[PDB]
Amino acid sequence: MKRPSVVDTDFERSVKEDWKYVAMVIDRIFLWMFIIVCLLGTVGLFLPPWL
Amino acid sequence: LTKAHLFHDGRVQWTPPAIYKSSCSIDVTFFPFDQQNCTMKFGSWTYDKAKIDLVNMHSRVDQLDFWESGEWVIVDAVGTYNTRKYECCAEIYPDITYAFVIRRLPLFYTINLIIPCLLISCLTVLVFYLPSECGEKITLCISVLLSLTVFLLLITEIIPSTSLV
Amino acid sequence: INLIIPCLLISCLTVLVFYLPSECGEKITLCISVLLSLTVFLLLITEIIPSTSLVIPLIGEYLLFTMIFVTLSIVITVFVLNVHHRSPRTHTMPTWVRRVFLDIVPRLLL
Amino acid sequence: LTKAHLFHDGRVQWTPPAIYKSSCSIDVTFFPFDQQNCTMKFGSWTYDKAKIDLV
Ligand SMILES: *[C@@H]1O[C@H](CO)[C@@H](O)[C@H](O)[C@H]1NC(C)=O
Ligand SMILES: *[C@@H]1O[C@H](CO)[C@@H](O)[C@H](O)[C@H]1NC(C)=O
Ligand SMILES: CC(=O)OCC[N+](C)(C)C
Ligand SMILES: CC(=O)OCC[N+](C)(C)C
Numbered sequence: 001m002k003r004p005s006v007v008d009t010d011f012e013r014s015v016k017e018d019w020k021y022v023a024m025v026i027d028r029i030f031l032w033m034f035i036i037v038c039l040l041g042t043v044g045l046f047l048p049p050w051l
Numbered sequence: 052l053t054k055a056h057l058f059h060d061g062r063v064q065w066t067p068p069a070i071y072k073s074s075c076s077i078d079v080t081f082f083p084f085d086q087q088n089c090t091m092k093f094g095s096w097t098y099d100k101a102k103i104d105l106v107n108m109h110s111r112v113d114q115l116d117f118w119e120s121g122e123w124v125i126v127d128a129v130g131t132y133n134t135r136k137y138e139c140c141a142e143i144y145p146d147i148t149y150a151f152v153i154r155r156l157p158l159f160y161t162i163n164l165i166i167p168c169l170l171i172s173c174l175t176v177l178v179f180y181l182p183s184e185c186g187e188k189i190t191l192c193i194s195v196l197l198s199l200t201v202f203l204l205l206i207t208e209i210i211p212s213t214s215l216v
Numbered sequence: 217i218n219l220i221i222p223c224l225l226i227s228c229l230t231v232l233v234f235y236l237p238s239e240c241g242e243k244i245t246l247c248i249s250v251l252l253s254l255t256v257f258l259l260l261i262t263e264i265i266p267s268t269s270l271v272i273p274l275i276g277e278y279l280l281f282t283m284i285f286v287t288l289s290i291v292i293t294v295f296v297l298n299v300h301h302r303s304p305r306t307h308t309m310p311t312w313v314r315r316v317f318l319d320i321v322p323r324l325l326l
Numbered sequence: 327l328t329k330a331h332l333f334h335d336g337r338v339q340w341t342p343p344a345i346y347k348s349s350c351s352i353d354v355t356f357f358p359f360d361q362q363n364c365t366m367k368f369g370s371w372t373y374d375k376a377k378i379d380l381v
């Protein structure tokens with residue numbers, strides 16, 4: 001992810017936009033973990049029985 | 052107690068109908084793809100082997116006039132002759148045990164339970180892709196949780212309450 | 217009266233989520249309500265019809281396919297909500313998306 | 327097992343009521359506009375065609 005390299009002047013808005021980007025980053029961390037777990041867990045639960 | 056067919060050489064043929072409710076342990080590990088093995092144990096109650104002895108008329112259970120149920124199919128239905136002693140009495144009592152191996156047809160429960168469950172589960176990870184400004188992240192994940200909670204109770208009303216598996 | 221008509225009413229709302237403005241912040245509520253109502257009616261029908269695998273009621277197939285399409289609409293609506301809330305400070309618009317979705321497709325859709 | 331009407335010429339008439347639970351295969355393809363075909367199969371249990379024939 002490449003945060004758009006845009007510069008701000010107002011400090012309060014600038015920070016409130018940094019917080020808004022930390023929230024996005026945290027979501028993407030788990031979006032991968034849950035995607036991986038859902039694919040890994042479901043395969044590791046139903047595949048062995050099918051064999 | 053239907054009539055019996057009596058021949059002139061002493062042979063007697065008796066084929067009464069019956070409706071039996073026999074207890075069989077059910078494993079639901081691979082439900083709705085499970086394969087049940089329910090047995091019936093038949094034997095003379097009072098007469099032991101020295102007095103009444105059973106003979107396997109034919110190992111396979113007759114199925115020519117079997118009524119296709121549409122939900123189960125009998126993979127194998129064979130009777131086994133066994134003899135074993137009981138603490139009641141000193142003699143050997145025989146018995147014939149019929150094992151009905153019935154395989155479930157999974158189309159119905161796949162469409163009504165499995166597929167609806169998958170569709171709800173597909174939405175588990177969508178919440179993380181929503182933008183926090185939408186103000187609907189909680190509605191999405193809460194709805195999924197309750198939806199799955201109900202689906203776990205519907206299954207709880209079908210499968211037996213066995214703790215083995 | 218007791219099954220078909222409510223099912224038709226719920227089906228009439230399947231595509232509405234795509235006409236709701238994103239600012240309303242209630243697309244998700246609508247599509248989730250539609251999905252859960254369809255699932256509830258599928259379960260209600262399940263308790264009436266026999267548990268056979270030889271045939272599938274046409275109503276059952278219709279409800280299942282509507283449920284599938286409502287799930288797809290939920291996915292697409294989540295994507296559209298994510299897109300709608302982008303700004304220069306978080307995402308940068310590629311040239312190709314600008315070109316396409318501001319010149320060609322809007323023109324094609326009148 | 328109601329009473330049977332017996333005539334002087336040896337005829338016997340028996341009209342007893344019955345409440346039968348007959349299994350039939352249900353087709354729900356066109357539910358709730360479906361049409362069912364549920365059968366009841368009656369016949370003598372022990373008397374073959376050479377001892378009792380139904381008309
Ligand atoms: C079914 O059960 C009987 C008795 O419990 C056993 O002898 C037989 O092997 C079983 N068959 C299968 C396929 O499980
Ligand atoms: C009903 O079933 C019987 C035998 O199952 C069949 O002979 C008959 O044609 C069926 N009735 C109709 C209207 O198809
Ligand atoms: C003698 C007698 O009544 O035995 C009954 C019990 N059983 C079937 C275990 C022998
Ligand atoms: C002889 C006798 O009792 O037969 C009963 C079975 N059935 C109905 C198939 C003839």
Ligand SMILES: [Ca+2]
Nearest residue numbers: 185186187241
């Ligand atoms: Ca709101």
